[PDB]
Design a protein around this ligand. Structure first.
Ligand SMILES: [Ba+2]
Lengths: 366, 15
């Protein structure tokens, strides 16, 4: 089999075992998967040439997953650049940091009534984590004072994010995240902007796989579908069985739409400008993790259209090896290239759902 | 022998 299929095959083997109980390596059986071969080869070319994106060096790693938002099907996944070894695309050992803000803080805040419009005012000013004198600093180290919720997301304020989680509460945030396939042994306010505050087993935290599936719920109206690498298995006895995810409601369509409208500005005028495409209706969010006690261990980007969701992680094998300079550009560029490939031959815009009304650049609940 | 196919049902691997 081709090298570019190694990561996908590994996950196919795992899901076949989960769904049927058999190991396709020891038990003969035919399996039909959801990988888009051309898309997969394209992702490999994005990773391993200078055609689409320029890298600072050949050591910087990239790991991404592309999901079909309508059914959770994984169409492409590549865990590294330059048999069935560790697949970073599904590993939850790295911190997706600020990329956690939309699904951890804002989505549940809107879903549960903390905010009723994208114009609601919030206050970006010096703030400490609840119960401490430990300051929450914004990525740019500044404060913009009284601003709209939409601008808060546009410029990725950490202050506003942490106070939002405080309002949502650790219980509800946990439940909301669980509905999006993400979990932690225990929730803390630090999780408002981090997925790896402490070492945890594989089932907890974020990975490109989980993040792609999570953001797909935004794209499709609020429905969560588990990552699906297989659609059919034909066992040696002749029987043929199909596999598809029924889906569950993770958030109201009104919540999904509002979140989408704000993440559109992240790209058009905000921190996600590096992924902006004027001809495509898409929304996204940049992500950055931080060291303890400009450099960072991880730089992420997650974006989606009404058809696909793609989560991207970048960083070095040893987190202590920092991303620096133009290295921070890669995540958004990998996404930009892939989504172009996936959309240029396409790609409708979202339609404001029942229960919401528009007033200029903002959206409000009735 | 386990044959794997892509989303267009074309063979991509034999494991
Ligand atoms: Ba973990």
């Amino acid at each position: 089999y081709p090298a570019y299929m190694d990561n996908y095959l590994k996950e196919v083997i795992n899901q076949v075992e989960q769904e049927t109980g058999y190991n396709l390596l020891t038990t003969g059986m035919d399996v039909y998967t959801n990988v888009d071969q051309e898309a997969q080869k394209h992702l490999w070319d994005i990773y391993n040439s200078d055609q689409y994106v320029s890298y600072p060096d050949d050591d910087l790693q990239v790991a991404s997953t592309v999901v079909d938002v309508s059914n959770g099907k994984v169409i492409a996944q590549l865990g590294a650049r330059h048999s069935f070894g560790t697949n970073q695309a599904v590993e939850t050992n790295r911190d997706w940091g600020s990329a956690m803000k939309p699904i951890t803080d804002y989505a549940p805040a809107i879903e549960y009534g903390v905010y009723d419009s994208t114009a609601t005012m919030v206050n970006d000013i010096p703030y400490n984590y609840p119960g401490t004198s430990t300051p929450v600093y914004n990525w740019d180290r500044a404060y913009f004072g009284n601003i709209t919720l939409q601008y808060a997301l546009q410029q990725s304020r950490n202050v506003t994010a942490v106070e939002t989680l405080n309002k949502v509460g650790l219980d509800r945030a946990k439940t909301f995240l669980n509905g999006l396939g993400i979990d932690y042994p225990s929730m803390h306010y630090a999780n408002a902007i981090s997925s790896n505050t402490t070492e945890s087993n594989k089932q907890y935290g974020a990975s490109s796989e989980k993040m792609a599936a999570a953001y797909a719920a935004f794209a499709n109206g609020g429905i969560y579908h588990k990552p699906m690498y297989i659609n059919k298995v034909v066992f040696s006895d002749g029987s043929k069985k199909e596999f598809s995810d029924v889906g569950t409601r993770a958030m109201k369509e009104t919540t999904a739409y509002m979140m989408t409208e704000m993440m559109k500005t992240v790209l058009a005028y905000g921190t996600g400008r590096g992924a902006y495409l004027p001809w495509l209706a898409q929304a996204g969010k940049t992500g950055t993790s931080n060291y303890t006690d400009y450099v960072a261990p991880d730089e992420m980007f997650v974006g989606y259209t009404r058809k696909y969701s793609m989560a991207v992680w970048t960083g070095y094998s040893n987190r202590l090896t920092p991303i620096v300079g133009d290295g921070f550009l890669v995540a958004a560029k990998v996404y930009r290239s892939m989504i172009t490939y996936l959309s240029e031959g396409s790609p409708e815009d979202w339609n404001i759902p029942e229960g919401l009304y528009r007033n200029g650049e903002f959206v409000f609940k009735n | 022998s386990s044959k794997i196919y892509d989303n267009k049902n074309q063979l991509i691997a034999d494991l």
